[PDB]
């Protein structure tokens, strides 16, 4: 597939048509049989993992070749969820960006990677718990807010459980969906679920993002509405010394 | 020959009669500008 | 004919938006006192062409930027508290 | 909370993803300020007139 459909496929972390098999394990390649049935083995010392192909499939490892942890066997597109678990979160990030660009580039478009990066990182915002310290053992949690517990219960109040987690490739939509602040969350496909829930828990916003404050009619937390700049006062020569002569009174 | 300045356009120009139509659209019907006024009693934002 | 002296203006500040905020905050005071507040006065004040002679440009922000551009004003990020800021403000012919 | 933190450890793991589920709502309500039962309204409020003209 090409064009915009690809860019969505990508930005949405979507397990495509012609997943074109990757080897789960390292090892040595062995193509076997033609026309009748086509299968490929990547068997190292110990394990012998077998990858049955369509037969029509245009595989791109010839017999004998040595192979890599998550290396493509077959051609086609690659599942970004299969890549996550086989070969980590960075390798994922690096696939997404470089593939998304593979199209804008291929066409005519020139844009900087950082944009795509900024977005891609958000696809990696959350992680699911395995064996917790405080909360229930299954919940999805923001990568940072788990460090708010991991490197918290292993320093000052050290002990209990560091909270083990798993890397969690969220598609662009899904990730947008699971977004802390209820105000923002409300604007998506089912506003009731949000509010119902957020009402039960004394949930609070804090209104960090923008989608939030525009909803309220508040002054956007960016540009001139950035905490880092909007408090800036300007005092004016004679105003300053005259303001100084009523301070020691 | 340049109207503004009788001096000739340097290098020849294709000139001739071309049938040209006036289309359904016109600036008359478009082009609107408000400062203030009629606020809807329902939605409370300016409309009509 | 881009903003007059803006390259200099962007360099005066850390984050550009700060620039806006100062221009604004100044064009603010510079309005809420009939311009009896200028730092630039003499023959520095910006002006207007007409069916008539040079009149005092009536654009606060335009004045604000000319003003700032002379190092004669200061950006307190937190200098002089907001409670005392509206105090000695309404003094030198405000109403 | 108790009866569930116990139904946390020794289940048949089938309907154990419903035992855990219960607590999210339980503990939510627990450190909230929300007394449940407020989910059932005695008085129904009326939206102010000018917001429904």
Curated annotation (Swiss-Prot), chain A:
This is DNA-directed RNA polymerase subunit beta'. Coiled coil: none annotated. It comes from Thermus aquaticus. The chain holds residues 1253 to 1501 of 1524 of the full protein. The RNAP catalytic core consists of 2 alpha, 1 beta, 1 beta' and 1 omega subunit. When a sigma factor is associated with the core the holoenzyme is formed, which can initiate transcription. DNA-dependent RNA polymerase catalyzes the transcription of DNA into RNA using the four ribonucleoside triphosphates as substrates. The lineage of its organism: Bacteria, Thermotogati, Deinococcota, Deinococci, Thermales. Belongs to the RNA polymerase beta' chain family.
Curated annotation (Swiss-Prot), chain B:
It comes from the Bacteria. Belongs to the RNA polymerase beta chain family. DNA-dependent RNA polymerase catalyzes the transcription of DNA into RNA using the four ribonucleoside triphosphates as substrates. The RNAP catalytic core consists of 2 alpha, 1 beta, 1 beta' and 1 omega subunit. When a sigma factor is associated with the core the holoenzyme is formed, which can initiate transcription. This is DNA-directed RNA polymerase subunit beta. It comes from Thermus aquaticus. The lineage of its organism: Bacteria, Thermotogati, Deinococcota, Deinococci, Thermales.
Swiss-Prot record, chain C:
Keywords: DNA-directed RNA polymerase, Nucleotidyltransferase, Transcription, Transferase. GO terms for molecular function: DNA binding; DNA-directed RNA polymerase activity. It holds the Pfam family RNA_pol_Rpb6. GO terms for biological process: DNA-templated transcription. It comes from the Bacteria. GO terms for cellular component: DNA-directed RNA polymerase complex. InterPro entries: DNA-dir_RNA_pol_omega, Pol_omega/Rpo6/RPB6, RPB6/omega-like_sf. Its EC number is 2.7.7.6. It catalyses: RNA(n) + a ribonucleoside 5'-triphosphate = RNA(n+1) + diphosphate. It is an enzyme of class 2 (transferase). Promotes RNA polymerase assembly. Latches the N- and C-terminal regions of the beta' subunit thereby facilitating its interaction with the beta and alpha subunits. The RNAP catalytic core consists of 2 alpha, 1 beta, 1 beta' and 1 omega subunit. When a sigma factor is associated with the core the holoenzyme is formed, which can initiate transcription. Belongs to the RNA polymerase subunit omega family. This is DNA-directed RNA polymerase subunit omega. It comes from Thermus aquaticus.
Curated annotation (Swiss-Prot), chain D:
The RNAP catalytic core consists of 2 alpha, 1 beta, 1 beta' and 1 omega subunit. When a sigma factor is associated with the core the holoenzyme is formed, which can initiate transcription. It comes from Thermus aquaticus. DNA-dependent RNA polymerase catalyzes the transcription of DNA into RNA using the four ribonucleoside triphosphates as substrates. This is DNA-directed RNA polymerase subunit beta'. Belongs to the RNA polymerase beta' chain family. Coiled coil: none annotated. It comes from the Bacteria.
């Amino acid at each position: 597939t090409q064009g915009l459909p690809r860019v969505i496929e990508l930005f949405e972390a979507r397990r495509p048509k012609a997943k074109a098999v990757i080897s789960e394990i390292d090892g040595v390649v062995r193509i076997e049989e033609g026309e009748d049935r086509l299968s490929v083995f990547v068997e190292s010392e110990g394990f012998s993992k077998e990858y049955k192909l369509p037969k029509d499939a245009r595989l791109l490892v010839k017999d004998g070749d040595y192979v890599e942890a998550g290396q493509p066997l077959t051609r086609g597109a690659i599942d970004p969820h299969q890549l996550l678990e086989a070969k980590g979160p960075e390798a994922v990030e690096r696939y997404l960006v470089d593939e998304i660009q593979k199209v804008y580039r291929a066409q005519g478009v020139k844009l900087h990677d950082k944009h795509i990066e900024i977005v891609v990182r958000q696809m990696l915002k959350y992680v699911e718990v395995t064996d917790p310290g405080d909360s229930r053992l299954l919940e999805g949690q923001v990568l940072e807010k788990w460090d708010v517990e991991a490197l918290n219960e292993r320093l000052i109040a050290e002990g209990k459980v560091p909270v083990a987690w798993k890397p969690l490739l969220m598609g662009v939509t899904k990730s947008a969906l699971s977004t802390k602040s209820w105000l923002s969350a409300a604007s998506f496909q089912n506003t009731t679920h949000v509010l119902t829930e957020a009402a039960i828990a004394g949930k609070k916003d804090e209104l960090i993002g923008l989608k939030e404050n525009v909803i309220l009619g508040r002054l956007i937390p960016a540009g001139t509405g950035s905490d880092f700049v909007r408090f800036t006062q300007v005092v004016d020569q004679r105003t300053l010394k005259a303001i100084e002569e009523a301070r020691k009174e | 020959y340049d109207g503004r300045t009788g001096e000739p356009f340097e290098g020849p120009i294709v000139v001739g009669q071309m049938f040209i139509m006036k289309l359904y659209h016109m600036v008359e019907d478009k082009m609107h500008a408000r400062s203030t006024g009629p606020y809807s009693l329902i939605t409370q934002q300016p409309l009509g | 004919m881009a903003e007059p002296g803006i390259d200099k203006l962007f360099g005066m500040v850390d984050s550009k938006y700060r620039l806006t905020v100062v221009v604004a905050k100044r064009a603010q005071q510079l309005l809420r006192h009939r311009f009896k507040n200028t730092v630039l006065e003499p023959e520095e004040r910006p002006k207007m062409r007409t069916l008539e002679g040079l009149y005092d440009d009536p654009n606060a922000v335009t004045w604000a930027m000319k003003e700032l551009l002379t190092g004669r004003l200061f950006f307190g990020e937190n200098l002089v508290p907001e409670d005392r800021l509206q105090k000695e403000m309404e003094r030198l012919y405000p109403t | 909370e108790r009866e569930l933190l116990e139904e946390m450890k020794h289940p048949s793991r089938a309907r154990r993803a419903k035992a855990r589920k219960r607590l999210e709502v339980v503990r939510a309500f627990l450190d909230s300020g929300n007394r449940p039962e407020w989910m059932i309204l005695e008085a129904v409020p009326v939206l102010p007139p000018d917001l429904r003209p």
